[PDB]
Design a protein around this ligand. Structure first.
Ligand code: YHR
Ligand code: LNR
Lengths: 381, 379
């Protein structure tokens, strides 16, 4: 039944981020710049304030009930999006989407770590989970775009709700969301784990790579309109190479980094993240961003697939075998990088500028890259 | 004949590089043989290896006016003589002090020979494209000397005794003198290190070359301490470095201009740092074929991407001469070979060699973002 758990996480993370990326191409057309920016950040902020309360929560109720709650909140958010047509209602739906995604991500990654106890196999299970995440990000944009250009606004949200119902049936079949079972092992407190430089280094690498992508997310279209003066239909396709490379890289490197070397995988991934971010503000046309964006996506996939099991290896080597808090910290890094991007990108660009922002991010990644060597062989307990 | 000057300069540079890289795997073994504990003498070994760089740095400014005053053949002949004494002293020295004098003489003679021979080659070939054919051939001979000398002394220290390779090199030096025996300005360097762009390029070259500069005095001792390899493999381990450097320099001289020189230099510095980090984890001679080959390829990348950048920087702003790119990278070379081995003894005494490799790799990686300064430099 171990494989069956991965199937849910493949589909749980598939649909959780499908609404996260299907709402972007329907909101600015529907409501028709700062006001729209704060809307997207609602998922990031609200999940950040709930992650510390979710980590220890999984130590007493298990990963099943939080996942079922995330499913329920997914259903409610998508159905509310299907009907609500005001700024406040969309903000509430976004906040619900963020909180439910918090449960879904944390519980899914924790249960994936728990049910897989071999580092080599767990480096491929998480790789395929991140591949499903990349597939969801790939399919979110064209889905909503096409069925808003044709079927109607409530159509894609209704279809996603039906797929969520299928997900609930699947979780009733295999995940068993019926009873609360506390974890036998007592996880270490979060503020012990924040004092461990190894977990700090891993979380920092993840947070800095995802900050490199997150800052690029909203800031890139503004730079495109300012410099290249390009139509709208290909702006979403601009990030398509990055997401495709992320999917390919997460699968391949979940296969490969176990034999390549985890520390080396993270180091080279951060180095290519830095180099790609340096080269990104140098492109003079849409074709010029295929290379740097593809490299950045592959690098972020490398960092994710190499540090996602590295957290489990660290917690198994030093701390106890309770997995909620470490992935709570990792998702906190993810979500903080997500939050810092859109709410502050305009101010950062107006103050220093996009090229200097990318240079700063890339230099931080490069200078931080050697610190990943600290995880080559962390001492045991 | 003009080709005679080419062959004599080729032999001179080849012999200089051969001596430099043949003193590498013999001095640690030679010192160990006398006693039969190298952590106490590592500092003196580093100072000995840096003596040539220090002495060359001291004597470099005088050679210019010295060459102007008396000519080229006499200082070039002086290099032959001092190299002969260096080879003979290496063949017969038994104490540390004698070897130090031999290395200092080798440095003085190397400076004399290199400067005088390159000046004579420039004087004879006034085609202005010839140097590109003749200078390229001379540098290829330098690369061949680096390729051959390191395993040479490694190969023939357990087979033909101790002074055999040095005697052969002295005999070749006699042939080099015989070949030459039947024969017949702008922007001084002190103002070329006041520009931050050229300083960035020179620092890149020096920090990339420091990976091998530190390796030369301490790697054979590390091998004899941890792996217990045979005495004819210590100089063999540097064979992958030479092969990788030749492959990388050719390939990237072909291929670097299309992807951008700054990107090639940045990637090369990053891979230099990664390879120097990977070096301490090698657990046998076979394990070092990967990291050492990668480090050699990385240094070749850095050189092939920096030398054209140095040429462009010198041409756009200052008035460049045939040796401006040679001089600036040379000063980086001597500075690296003097500051690496000199502080290497102290660093390995305080902390292990792996920490030294980690430190050098970290400096290279952190300096790597500084290569953005050279992306389209403006007057
Ligand atoms: C030692 O003797 C040197 O110092 C030469 C080499 C130094 C260093 C090195 N030592 C080793 C020792 C080993 O065993 C212990 C094994 C491997 C290595 C390697 C591999 C890496 N490496 C580089 C070697 C290359 C030489 O430099 C040039 O070839 C050159 C080329 C140019 O144009 C193309 C120039 O510009 C016209 C120029 O002038 C500035 C110089 C350099 O200086 C003459
Ligand atoms: N884990 C998500 C990752 O940061 C990412 C990669 C590529 C993207 O186009 C994206 O929106 C997010």
């Amino acid at each position: 039944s171990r494989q069956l758990v991965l199937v849910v996480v493949f589909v749980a993370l598939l649909l959780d981020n499908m609404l996260f990326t299907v709402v972007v191409p329907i909101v600015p057309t529907f409501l028709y710049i700062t006001r729209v920016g704060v809307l997207f950040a609602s998922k990031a902020v609200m999940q950040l304030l709930v992650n510390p309360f979710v980590g220890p929560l999984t130590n007493r109720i298990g990963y099943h009930i939080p996942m079922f709650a995330g499913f329920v909140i997914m259903f409610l958010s998508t159905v509310m999006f299907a009907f609500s047509g005001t700024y406040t209602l969309l903000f509430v739906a976004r906040t619900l989407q963020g909180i439910g995604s918090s449960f879904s991500s944390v519980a899914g990654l924790g249960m994936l770590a728990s049910v897989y106890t071999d580092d080599h196999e767990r480096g491929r299970a998480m790789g395929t989970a991140l591949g499903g995440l990349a597939l969801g990000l790939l399919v979110g944009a064209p889905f909503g775009s096409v069925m808003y250009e044709f079927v109607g606004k409530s159509a894609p949200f209704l279809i996603l709700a039906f797929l969520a119902l299928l997900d609930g049936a699947l979780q009733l079949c295999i995940l068993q969301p019926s009873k609360v079972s506390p974890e036998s092992a007592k996880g270490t407190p979060l503020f012990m784990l924040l004092k461990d430089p190894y977990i700090l280094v891993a979380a920092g690498s993840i947070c800095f790579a995802n900050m490199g992508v997150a800052i690029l997310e909203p800031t890139l279209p503004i730079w495109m309109m300012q410099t290249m003066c390009s139509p709208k239909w290909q702006l979403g396709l601009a990030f398509l190479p990055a997401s495709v490379s992320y999917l390919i890289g997460t699968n391949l490197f979940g296969v490969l980094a176990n034999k390549m070397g985890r520390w080396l995988c993270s180091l080279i991934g951060m180095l290519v993240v830095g180099t790609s971010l340096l080269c990104v503000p140098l492109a003079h046309n849409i074709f010029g961003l295929i290379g740097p964006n593809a490299g950045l996506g592959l690098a972020i996939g490398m960092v994710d697939s190499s540090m996602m099991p590295i957290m489990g290896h660290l917690v198994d080597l030093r701390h106890t075998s309770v997995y909620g808090s470490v992935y709570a910290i990792a998702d906190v890094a993810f979500c903080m990088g997500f939050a810092i991007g859109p709410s502050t990108g305009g101010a950062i660009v107006k103050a220093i500028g996009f090229p200097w922002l990318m240079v700063i991010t890339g230099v931080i990644n490069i200078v931080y890259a050697p610190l990943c060597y600290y995880l080559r062989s962390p001492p045991a307990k």
